[PDB]
């Protein structure tokens, strides 16, 4: 006999045993080298799908910009960028009729948000492209470095603090002919001991209009690591800091639309999405009659990003906002305009190897224009020749198509309007439809009397999709009678079934800290028992495996067990010294208290009863040096990446023990020319540290003020010292000292 597990599917339905199809217990595929090879392919495909469009050259950028919108209608099933504005404007109009006043109320909420929102808000989020240093940096630093140059130049309207005032500067910053920017530079020296030692300094450099404007409209590129369900690697992208600010409000407008739409799959979370789907199926059976055939197509759109054109989004924004004030329309219209004239930086570059010489070498992305084609292979050198046509300031202009998941929400609105068009009363045909859309994936449900009518409908959908740059993947998609379907990895079989294997990667050591990981790993089991149908015994096992994983990972083996590790020597000393053994946390080589019932209680609070008063005093000492509290909104927040998802921050419940510690930072930036940015951080963090002594509240609620940090502290110090004098317990000589010191500091301020 030869074993064959996929024979199970003879007896058990595929959906009921769908866990066995996912091989997510093994490692995922990583991209090793540079994404430049994939980026160029993306850039080529985007122009190739829009090839019949009208070319032009930009007045400011000087880049070749392909303009497919309102081009020739396609006459084949291949992916097309050739959309039609009059169709989109009919779809968006059709949405407005079907949902009356939806745009008004959604716009009015955005209107408030624009006037309300601070610059502070833009520090939140994923890495952005810092044009100051020509690389990806964390969102907070990109903003600070952008404001640094803006304020060093004449653009200081952002000093008010409100986001709209910062966005005012962004458009004015294009008016500078020569934008002065400070950049780091290395410098060798000789210091005795005799050592030849290096140091890093400053360098002022001016960028012309071309140099700045092209850097502002640059989207950086990387490869998508750990992407499951795929063979070949992908090319993900990252936005600049100028364009970032405007996209927020355009996505915020879209969110307020999508929240109120019946057929929108975003922005809703796991179970809410499952409910929102399950309800539209019942809505469909409510809407339809008894003598109608209902067919559910399990959709998926091909090259979703590359087809849809930012000029269509400009039409969508302008039509959705039609009626609102012209400042508000123009403000939201910025991001489509910036996307429509955008450029794309092509990664790090390429690496060459020499077999005879036995040496390797890295070549730059800018050097792809100035290089012989003998080094590259037939497939690559063909692409290098193509990309040279679009090359401007060492970057390729991607005027048509969207780069990556940036406009998701507003992109969904386009897809929803097509589902809206399928209303019985709007069509007045033998067929009609409804469904759900969530960016790239969608689920359609067509109803008619005979399969003639369903075929008639599916075509009417598919062709209408093509007319506005939506391209159904005929490979991946499939149709059947309403009853079973798939949607963003949720499997429906007369009701949504459990897919446990999707979550498996979460069942382990989260890698934040001892106290957190315990709270996470136990809640991961808890939540999977409710939603993903993790059965009692397997949940009991999950605890036993998670504890063993946790012990081996953190080297916190139970005090009695004879294993040779660095910690166990010091853990034995505690284990022997402690009276109550059950009082000790697993992190300090104690026993596992957990079981099904206990999972929702934190370890510290659970073992508090059995704890040693000496132990719990030291463990929960507020004066310990291991914990590092910074801000309330960031407290008790880990970061976890699931199997299918971009990036998630997860909350965890645990007591502030010594085990809540931060691990070491990456120190590779010491070697490189960015060594000063470490020193800047020391000054910035310690400047806030001292401010927080004067204003404790800044750790909880953000400190709102247009005045200076020093001026805020000095004004506090004077009044605090006077309140502590009059009523409080401070002497007249001690008061004088303070005020005199403040007076001296006020002079030392004015002297410089």
């Amino acid at each position: 006999m030869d074993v064959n597990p996929m024979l199970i599917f003879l007896k058990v339905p595929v959906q009921n045993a769908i866990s066995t199809t996912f091989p997510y217990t093994g490692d995922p595929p990583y991209s090793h080298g540079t994404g430049t090879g994939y980026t160029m392919d993306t850039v080529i495909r985007t122009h190739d799908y829009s090839s019949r469009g009208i070319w032009k050259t930009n007045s400011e950028t000087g880049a070749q910009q392909l303009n497919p919108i309102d081009g020739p209608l396609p006459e084949d099933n291949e992916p097309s960028g050739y959309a039609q504005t009059d169709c989109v404007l009919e779809l968006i109009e059709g949405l407005d009729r079907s949902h009356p006043g939806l745009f008004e109320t959604a716009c009015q909420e955005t209107i408030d948000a624009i006037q309300q929102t601070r610059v502070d808000k833009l520090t939140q989020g994923r890495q952005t492209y810092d044009w100051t240093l020509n690389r990806n940096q964390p969102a907070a630093t990109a903003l600070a470095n952008t404001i640094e140059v803006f304020r060093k130049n004449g653009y200081k309207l952002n000093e008010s603090g409100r986001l709209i005032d910062f966005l005012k500067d962004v458009l004015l910053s294009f008016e500078n002919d020569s934008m002065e920017v400070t950049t780091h530079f290395q410098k060798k020296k000789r210091i005795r001991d005799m050592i030849t030692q290096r140091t890093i300094g400053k360098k002022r450099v001016k960028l012309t209009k071309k140099n700045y404007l092209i850097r502002a409209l640059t989207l950086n590129t990387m490869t998508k690591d750990a992407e499951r369900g795929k063979l070949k690697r992908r090319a993900i992208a990252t936005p600049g800091m100028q364009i970032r600010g405007f996209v927020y409000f355009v996505e915020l407008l879209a969110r307020n639309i999508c929240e109120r739409l019946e057929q929108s799959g975003l922005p809703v979370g796991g179970n809410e999405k499952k409910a929102k789907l399950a309800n539209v199926i019942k809505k469909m059976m409510a809407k339809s009659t008894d003598e109608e055939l209902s067919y559910t197509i399990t959709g998926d759109n091909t090259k979703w990003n590359e087809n849809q054109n930012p000029r269509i989004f400009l039409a969508m924004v302008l039509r959705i906002t039609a009626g609102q004030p012209e400042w508000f329309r123009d403000l939201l219209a910025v991001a489509p305009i910036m996307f429509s004239n955008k450029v794309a930086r092509l990664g790090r570059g390429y690496m060459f190897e020499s077999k005879s010489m036995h040496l390797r070498t890295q070549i730059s992305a800018e050097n792809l224009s100035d290089i012989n084609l003998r080094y590259f292979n037939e497939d690559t050198k063909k692409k290098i020749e193509k990309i040279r046509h679009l090359m401007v300031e060492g970057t390729a202009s991607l005027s048509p198509g969207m780069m990556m998941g940036m406009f998701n929400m507003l992109s969904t609105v386009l897809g929803v309007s097509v589902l809206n068009l399928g209303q019985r009363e709007i069509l007045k045909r033998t067929y009609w439809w409804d469904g759900l859309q969530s960016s790239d994936d969608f689920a359609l449900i067509i109803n008619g009397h005979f399969k003639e009518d369903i075929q008639q409908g599916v075509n009417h959908f598919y062709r209408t999709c093509k007319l506005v740059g939506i391209n159904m993947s005929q490979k991946k998609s499939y149709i059947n009678k309403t009853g079973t379907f798939e949607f963003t990895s949720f499997f429906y079989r007369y009701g949504f079934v459990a897919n446990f294997s999707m979550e498996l990667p979460s069942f382990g050591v989260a890698g934040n800290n001892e106290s957190a990981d315990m709270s996470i790993g136990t809640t991961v089991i808890k939540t999977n028992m409710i939603n993903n149908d993790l059965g009692p015994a397997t949940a009991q096992m999950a605890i036993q495996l998670f504890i063993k994983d946790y012990r081996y990972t953190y080297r916190c083996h139970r005090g009695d067990t004879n294993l040779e590790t660095r910690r166990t020597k010091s853990i034995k000393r505690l284990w022997t010294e402690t009276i109550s053994k059950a009082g000790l946390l697993v992190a300090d080589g104690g026993p596992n208290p957990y079981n099904l019932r206990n999972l929702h209680i934190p370890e510290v609070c659970l073992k508090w009863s059995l704890m040693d008063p000496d132990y719990r005093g030291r463990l929960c000492n507020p004066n310990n040096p291991f914990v590092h509290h910074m801000e309330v909104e960031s407290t008790n927040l880990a970061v976890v990446m699931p199997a299918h998802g971009p990036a998630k921050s997860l909350e965890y419940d645990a007591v502030a023990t010594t085990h809540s510690w931060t691990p070491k930072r990456n120190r590779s930036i010491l070697n490189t020319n960015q060594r000063g940015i470490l020193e800047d951080e020391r000054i910035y963090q310690k400047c806030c540290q001292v401010f927080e002594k004067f204003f404790p509240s800044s750790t909880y609620r953000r400190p709102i003020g247009m005045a200076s940090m020093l001026d805020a502290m000095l004004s506090r110090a004077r009044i605090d010292a006077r309140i502590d004098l009059e009523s409080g317990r401070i002497s007249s000589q001690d008061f004088s000292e303070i005020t005199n010191t403040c007076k001296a500091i006020e002079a030392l301020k004015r002297q410089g």
């Binding site: 006999m1 030869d2 064959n4 597990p5 024979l7 199970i8 599917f9 003879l10 595929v14 009921n16 045993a17 866990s19 066995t20 199809t21 217990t25 490692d27 990583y30 209608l73 006459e75 084949d76 099933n77 039609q84 009919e90 369900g229 795929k230 067919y295 039509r319 060459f352 190897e353 020499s354 005879s356 010489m357 036995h358 040496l359 390797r360 070498t361 292979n377 399969k451 075509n459 598919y462 062709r463 093509k466 007319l467 991946k476 998609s477 149709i479 009678k481 009853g483 446990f500 498996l504 059965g535 015994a537 397997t538 009991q540 096992m541 036993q544 063993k548 081996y552 596992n592 099904l596």
Partner: protein, 482 residues
């Protein structure tokens, strides 16, 4: 945009569009569709980091000496149970490699193990070992301007993998991975006191799994991989320069209830200055085995085997002496791969959740804890294998181990090909299920999907086996249906 008013623009511009733009539904039928095109060429090779079915256990009963906790003193105790070492002799050539080095590495290892004292063992940097671990094989990094005009300067080989053919060894490996053994390999850490009635039922149900899983041979591989990779990661970080020796250990308990420490071989680590997750640490796998490599020469294409010794074995009837083979192999693993190797224990959950869901599916409708009447009341009513007669059925205990083995083999033979195949084959699996549910299924482009499925099937033995399993399923449906 503000002044626009619609005048059936979609309805007019739809008619003006060509008729070639259409989504025609090709009615799906399992009997009409073809089978998956398996790739042709040379036979596939054993790519796993350690030996699965073929490995030999140099075992010791119970604790002895100051070892147990210390890793090498376990391996010293295990080596002393075998006394039948010849002078090393090469009997299967690693065709591309300089095979004299492999013999010298084993001799230097066996010399160094004898000469060492203490806990850890760093081997001396000798030019035969340096070849095996790849010392100085990195080309030196330079500026482009420093070496512009070089004749043979090209980019790195950015080409697809070499296509391979399905072999019988990968199927047999799975058969053997599915089997039971007399050793309980998995040992679970402690749990809280069972207070809630559900926690007693959960424990009672967990005890039936504990037996069926812990005794399976897949667990032996899990515990092996866990030990190898956990030890290898910890060495890779601490001893970056040193060529450390790491033994291959799995501590277990017999069905009698007695302790045992088994030794499979040794792993000599290379230099581990790991920049990114994907960066590799080259190591030399040296593993004990009784199987002859010349009988299945294709399987061991990258291995160099040495006939190092001889021993006595008692057959069921007879008592026959046999020679032992040391499978030596230069290999490489990365932080990401050994990290997921450490976390292989979660392979149990993928199986046991799926098993438990099938029990709880019947428990609800039967209105009773079906836990015991599934395991205890033995009935062959789940199709898990295909024999020369037909499709053989097995029990919930067999299903557990079969589904465990898949979960393990997915972890061991982890690749982009599997990842891509699994996703695309699922769509066809769902179509078959939608047909068998009687939901008149259809596809817009069937043969385009087939191309996306077949694009993934290249050289990985596991992917090739799953691809064949899919055909075996596909025919098994077709025969039963029509």
């Amino acid at each position: 945009v503000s002044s626009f008013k619609a005048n059936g623009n979609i309805e007019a511009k739809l008619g003006a569009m060509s008729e070639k733009v259409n989504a025609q539904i090709e009615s799906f039928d399992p009997r009409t569709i073809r089978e998956l095109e398996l790739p042709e060429g040379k036979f596939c090779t054993q790519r796993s980091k350690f030996l699965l079915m073929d490995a030999m256990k140099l075992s010791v009963l119970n604790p002895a000496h100051e070892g147990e906790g210390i890793p090498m003193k376990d391996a010293k105790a295990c080596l002393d149970t075998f006394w039948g070492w010849k002078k090393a002799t090469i009997i299967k050539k690693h065709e591309k490699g300089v095979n004299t080095n492999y013999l010298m590495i084993w001799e230097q290892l066996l010399e160094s193990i004898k000469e060492m004292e203490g806990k850890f063992l760093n081997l001396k940097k000798t030019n035969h070992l340096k070849w095996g671990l790849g010392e100085g094989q990195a080309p030196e990094k330079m500026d482009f301007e420093d070496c512009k005009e070089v004749p043979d300067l090209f980019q790195y080989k950015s080409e697809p993998p070499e296509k391979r053919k399905l072999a019988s060894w990968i199927q047999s490996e799975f058969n053997k991975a599915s089997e039971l053994t007399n050793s309980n390999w998995i040992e679970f850490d402690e749990l809280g006191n069972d207070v809630a009635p559900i926690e007693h039922i959960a424990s009672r149900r967990r005890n039936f799994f504990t037996a069926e899983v812990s005794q399976c041979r897949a667990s032996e591989y899990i515990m092996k991989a866990v030990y190898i990779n956990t030890a290898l990661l910890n060495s890779s970080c601490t001893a970056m320069e040193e060529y450390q020796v790491i033994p291959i250990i799995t501590k277990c308990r017999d069905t009698s209830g007695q302790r045992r420490t088994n030794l499979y071989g040794f792993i000599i680590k290379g230099r581990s200055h790991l920049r990114n997750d994907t960066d590799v640490v080259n190591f030399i796998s040296l593993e004990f085995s009784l199987t002859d490599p010349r009988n299945e020469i294709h399987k061991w294409e990258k291995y160099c085997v040495l006939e190092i010794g001889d021993m006595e074995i008692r057959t069921s009837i007879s008592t026959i002496m046999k020679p032992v083979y040391l499978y030596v192999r230069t290999n490489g693993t990365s932080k990401i791969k050994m990290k997921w190797g450490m976390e292989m224990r979660r392979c149990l959950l993928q199986s046991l959740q799926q098993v438990e869901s099938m029990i709880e599916a019947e428990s609800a409708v039967k209105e009773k804890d079906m836990t015991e009447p599934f395991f205890r009341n033995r009935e062959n009513d789940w199709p898990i294998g295909e024999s020369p007669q037909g499709i053989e059925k097995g029990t919930i205990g067999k299903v557990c181990r079969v589904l465990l083995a898949k979960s393990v083999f997915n972890s061991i033979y982890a690749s982009a090909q599997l990842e891509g195949f699994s996703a695309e084959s699922r769509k066809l699996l769902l179509l078959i299920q939608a047909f068998r549910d009687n939901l008149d299924p259809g596809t817009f482009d069937l043969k385009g999907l087939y191309e996306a499925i077949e694009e993934c099937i290249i050289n990985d033995p596991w992917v090739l086996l799953n691809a064949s399993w899919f055909n075996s399923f596909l025919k098994a449906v077709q025969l039963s249906m029509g």
